């Protein structure tokens, strides 16, 4: 299985994960490839924000799935 993560700035990240991996492992991989601490990562799949402690199979994340990595903004 292989998944893609798209940032809010257009960058694309390719991750090699298994269907049984926890969201914590995926966040650690994203930290390794990006340097973003897991507590500051907001992942979205099919309109659901992925939460720590659960596995990918809970969200029906299969191969070639696309996640979105987003963040909040402070202007106004």
């Amino acid at each position: 299985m292989q998944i893609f993560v798209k940032t809010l700035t257009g960058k694309t990240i390719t991750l090699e994960v298994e269907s049984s991996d926890t969201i914590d492992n995926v966040k650690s991989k994203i930290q390794d490839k990006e340097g973003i601490p897991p507590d500051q990562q907001r992942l979205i799949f099919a309109g659901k924000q992925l939460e720590d402690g659960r596995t990918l199979s809970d969200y029906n994340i299969q191969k070639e799935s696309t996640l979105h990595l987003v963040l909040r903004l402070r202007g106004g």
């Binding site: 798209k6 809010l8 700035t9 257009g10 960058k11 694309t12 390794d32 490839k33 990006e34 340097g35 973003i36 507590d39 500051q40 907001r42 979205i44 799949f45 099919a46 309109g47 659901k48 924000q49 939460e51 696309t66 979105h68 987003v70 963040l71 909040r72 903004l73 402070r74 202007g75 106004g76």
Partner: protein
């Protein structure tokens, strides 16, 4: 020649070439209803060359649902003629015109053509011409809670900037013989496969410094590959790489060709089967209108819905679409055909205006090509929505009633909202509320709060403020403008000038917060957001947060007892550089700007403040001697800025400026190079000044040089302002006085029981007694943008540029220095419009009182890449306390004002928990490790008395509750997390 005093924030987003191209483009807008007027407003604020409007239809009352430039006295007049007058005022550099008749050949005058409120046949006729003549064509529709956008920029569109990001750059550590570029220690390049980079300052491989881009093959977060550089050399060290962004060719299809085989943009991946449905539905709408003299299906009418679905089936069969039609969704499109919501108009107008800017400037990645959107989760479910309640009542809210009904209108009209901030998002929110009819009922009310006043750079993205309003309060002007838009709000809006923070809890207290229905944030900082979030959590009020940054934006919703609060999640913090890097070894312009800001603070605001406070505090020295780490610095500062260097004229001010120039740009560098010569080697034998450390060079003053003279003028003017003298800008006096200065000689020094204490005491007593000076004060220099025109930004620019020339860094001009030092946030009108639209779409969910967490959507978007994402809010966590389910955010203990012992016994008896720590505010009221005597003193006191005693400050008369944080552990010794306590005074 762009007006940087008005487009200051927009230049940080677009640029100079982009706006130069933008100001040479003509935009035609067909249709002047809510969507059309929103697009025209955003375009006028953006700054295109001119806008031409075409809408000869007479005004009707229902049009007032989303058209905010129409009034009840304009019924029967063509919409363009009544809208041009209001649009002409938004921007004085953008003429707005009207055409009473349109011809095909007349379309060649315009750079972009936007089409709204037009049938499909007319759209085909227009596009058949614009496509072959290479004119950008955008078509937008808004039907109830559904929206569509279509872009066609020609067959050979050229995009110069795709993602809109700043070019990437980095410092190398080694380039092997096979092009394996390695970054510095634990530094990430951030590139991606297929990118182009160009190198400079590469030692050992000078050929790579020519500047020819090379393909990048990312092999890891720290290293990448560029190819084979065998011929260019063997191995290279150090250097800096910078990304190169290349143009792209995007090819679009015409509308006639696009109808058969469209290409969709998906605003939500949770519903990927819908856009094919909307593609058929909108065409069926057009056919139905063509079959009924341009009459859309009536609201919640079933015969029209059946006929519309027959048209949908016919169209789907004709186009050979292998799509199974979802009857419910298509009939929903039919029911809301005549809907006209200001929120959907705002959202789509922001998006379409951004597309227009893309067409004119050739930047960012356009929509390619169909963008179908819906917010069907906002449809009320707690009220009656039928043909009876959705029929028009001959009022200005017909467009909204056609979607929601009259009962929901009554619900909206009795809202009591509270809006924090009245900037750009605040103005958009107020306009949306005025159009929607919020708080126009007998029990409605709106409260606006904002402590700032109108400036010149705020008018561009804030369309309610005019150049005649400069200097007034933002909230008052916004309230008056929106009362003009909707006269029914006269007397229903109250505006304050209070900063929302810990010091204004006497105004926004329990009584104020009990009557509200919801709170909407329109702030620009995180501290105020967190404070308002805590207040909403305590009072259990819904909160609507939204933020923007250039072309990016987000919106979040906080619902009591359902979702987590705003402060339950973290965001990346602002970067703070190491003190060693800032002080001695900078290698970037940001480091030098930070150093210059610190120099300003410590040279014009710290010493003056210390001097002023010394003359007032009688016991300052007593605490300073034992508390501050280096009282010697304080004493020397007071002496120097009080007695030793008191100026009277301006010549001595210029001499002092020259002295400081030598101090900070010539002598410290010499000392540093005496300590660490240019040929020194580290403890490992490697060169010292290699890589992140750049060897500095002392600067010798030269009056003719622009930078040195600018620094001298800025520093002298700031010093004069400090000492209240008459500054001058005539270069003759500066030239005369700087030539007679002989710098004192400077030579670096190598260095080489209670004397120090006695020395400090002697210095202290040497100062004049406090009674010597009474009523004498000096004015510290504060930081602003030409509001206090003491050359603040100019001084910082000169200091930073001089220090950059010290380390051979590339200097930055005043624009970038203002951007960095001022911490300005790039702002766009389109992003503001989109976030306001999303927030107002969530507001109707909040009004309806939806209880399921899947019915709310937090929204994120980036308009530079055409990305939209929505996700359900995170539910608040639960916990177990005493074998009961407790919410960790929205639950609290409500107790009377009881003695500390009674509170402890209550927690021991009811919750079965042992209290270990108890604190209120910033004070530790009780802790298990305190000595028995202290506790025995503090046990029989009430909580209010205990807090007053510990904080040494009586509670205010308006204070009606206390919030306590308690940490307690179970019987077994396992620490238990419990909610906060709410003591009722």
């Amino acid at each position: 020649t762009i007006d940087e005093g008005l487009y200051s924030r927009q230049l940080y987003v677009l640029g100079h070439e982009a706006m130069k191209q933008m100001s040479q483009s003509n935009v035609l807008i067909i249709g002047c209803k809510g969507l059309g007027v929103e697009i025209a407003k955003n375009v006028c604020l953006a700054g295109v060359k001119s806008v031409t409007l075409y809408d000869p239809q007479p005004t009707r009352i229902e049009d007032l649902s989303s058209q905010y430039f129409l009034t009840e006295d304009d019924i029967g007049v063509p919409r363009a003629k009544v809208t041009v007058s209001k649009l002409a005022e938004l921007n004085q550099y953008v003429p707005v015109s009207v055409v009473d008749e349109l011809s095909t050949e007349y379309l060649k005058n315009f750079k972009c053509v936007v089409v709204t409120e037009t049938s499909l046949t007319k759209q085909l006729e227009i596009n058949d011409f614009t496509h072959k003549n290479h004119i950008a064509y955008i078509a937008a529709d808004s039907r109830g809670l559904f929206g569509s956008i279509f872009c066609d920029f020609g067959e050979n569109f050229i995009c110069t900037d795709t993602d809109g990001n700043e070019p990437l750059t980095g410092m190398i550590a080694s380039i092997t013989d096979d092009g394996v570029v390695t970054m510095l220690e634990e530094t990430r390049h951030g590139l991606e496969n297929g990118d182009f980079v160009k190198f400079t300052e590469v030692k050992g491989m000078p050929g790579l410094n020519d500047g020819t881009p090379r393909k990048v093959e990312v092999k890891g977060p720290y290293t990448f590959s560029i190819g084979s550089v065998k011929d260019l050399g063997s191995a290279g060290y150090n250097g800096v790489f910078t990304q190169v962004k290349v143009p792209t060719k995007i090819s679009f299809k015409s509308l006639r060709e696009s109808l058969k085989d469209p290409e969709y943009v998906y605003p939500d991946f949770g519903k990927m089967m819908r856009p094919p449905q909307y593609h058929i539905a909108f065409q069926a709408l057009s056919a139905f209108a063509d079959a009924h003299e341009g009459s859309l299906p009536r609201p919640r009418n079933d015969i029209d819905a059946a006929e519309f679905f027959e048209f949908c089936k016919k169209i789907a069969s004709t186009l050979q679409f292998d799509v199974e039609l979802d009857e419910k969704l298509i009939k929903e499109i039919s029911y809301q055909a005549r809907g006209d919501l200001v929120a959907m108009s705002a959202f789509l107008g922001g998006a379409v205006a951004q597309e227009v800017l893309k067409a004119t400037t050739s930047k960012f990645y356009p929509l390619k090509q169909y963008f179908y959107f819906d917010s069907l989760e906002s449809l009320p479910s707690s009220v009656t929505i039928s043909e009876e309640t959705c029929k028009p009542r001959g009022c200005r809210y017909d467009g909204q009633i056609a979607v929601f009904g009259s009962e929901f209108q009554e619900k909206i009209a009795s809202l009591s909202t509270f809006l924090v901030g009245a900037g750009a998002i605040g103005c958009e929110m107020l306009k949306n509320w005025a159009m929607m009819g919020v708080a126009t009922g007998e029990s409605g009310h709106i409260s606006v709060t904002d402590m700032d006043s109108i400036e010149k750079s705020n008018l561009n993205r804030q369309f309610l403020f005019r150049p005649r309003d400069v200097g007034k309060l933002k909230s008052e002007c916004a309230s008056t403008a929106v009362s003009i838009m909707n006269p029914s709000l006269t007397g229903k809006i109250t505006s304050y000038q209070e900063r929302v923070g810990p010091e204004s809890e006497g105004i926004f207290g329990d009584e104020f917060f009990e009557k509200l229905s919801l709170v909407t944030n329109a702030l620009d900082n995180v501290e105020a957001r967190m404070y308002v979030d805590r207040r909403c959590v305590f009072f259990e009020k819904p909160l609507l947060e939204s933020g923007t940054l250039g072309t990016k934006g987000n919106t979040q919703v906080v619902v009591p007892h359902l979702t987590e609060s705003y402060g339950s999640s973290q965001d990346p913090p602002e970067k703070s550089f190491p003190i060693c890097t800032l002080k001695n070894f900078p290698n970037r312009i940001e480091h030098t700007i930070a150093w210059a800001r610190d120099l300003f603070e410590g040279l014009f605001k710290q010493p003056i403040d210390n001097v002023n406070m010394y003359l007032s505090s009688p016991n300052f020295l007593e605490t300073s001697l034992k508390t501050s780490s280096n009282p010697r610095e304080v004493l020397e500062n007071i002496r120097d800025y009080l007695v030793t260097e008191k100026p009277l004229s301006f010549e001595e001010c210029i001499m002092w400026a020259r002295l400081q120039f030598d101090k900070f740009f010539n002598n410290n560098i010499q000392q540093l190079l005496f300590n660490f010569p240019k040929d020194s080697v580290t403890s490992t034998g490697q060169p010292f000044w290699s890589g992140p450390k750049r060897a500095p060079t002392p600067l010798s003053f030269d009056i003719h040089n622009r930078e040195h003279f600018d620094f001298i003028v800025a520093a002298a003017s700031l010093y004069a302002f400090n000492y209240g003298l008459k500054s001058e800008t005539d270069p003759a006096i500066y030239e005369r006085v700087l030539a007679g200065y002989n710098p004192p000689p400077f030579a670096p020094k190598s260095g080489i029981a209670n004397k120090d204490k006695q020395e400090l005491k002697s210095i202290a007593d040497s100062l004049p007694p406090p009674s010597s000076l009474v009523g004498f004060r000096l004015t510290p220099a504060e930081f602003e943008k030409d509001d206090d025109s003491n050359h603040h930004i100019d001084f910082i620019t000169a200091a930073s540029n001089l220090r950059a020339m010290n380390y051979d860094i590339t200097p930055a001009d005043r624009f970038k220095t203002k951007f960095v030092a001022g911490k300005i946030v790039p702002a766009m009108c389109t992003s503001t419009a989109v976030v306001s639209g999303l927030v107002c779409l969530e507001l109707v969910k909040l009004v309806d009182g939806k209880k399921k967490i899947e019915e709310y959507k937090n929204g994120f978007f980036n308009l530079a890449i055409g990305l939209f994402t929505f996700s359900d809010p995170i539910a608040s966590p639960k916990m177990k306390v005493n074998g009961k389910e407790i919410d960790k955010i929205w639950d609290r203990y409500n107790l009377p004002d009881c003695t500390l012992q009674e509170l402890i016994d209550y927690f021991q008896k009811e919750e079965g928990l042992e209290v270990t720590m108890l604190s209120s505010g910033v004070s530790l009221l009780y802790a298990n490790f305190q000595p028995p005597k202290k506790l025995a003193e503090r046990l029989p006191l009430k909580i209010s008395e205990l807090v007053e005693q510990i904080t040494k400050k009586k509670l205010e008369p308006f204070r009606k509750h206390l919030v306590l944080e308690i940490c307690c552990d179970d019987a077994n010794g396992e620490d238990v997390e419990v909610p906060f306590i709410c003591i009722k005074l």
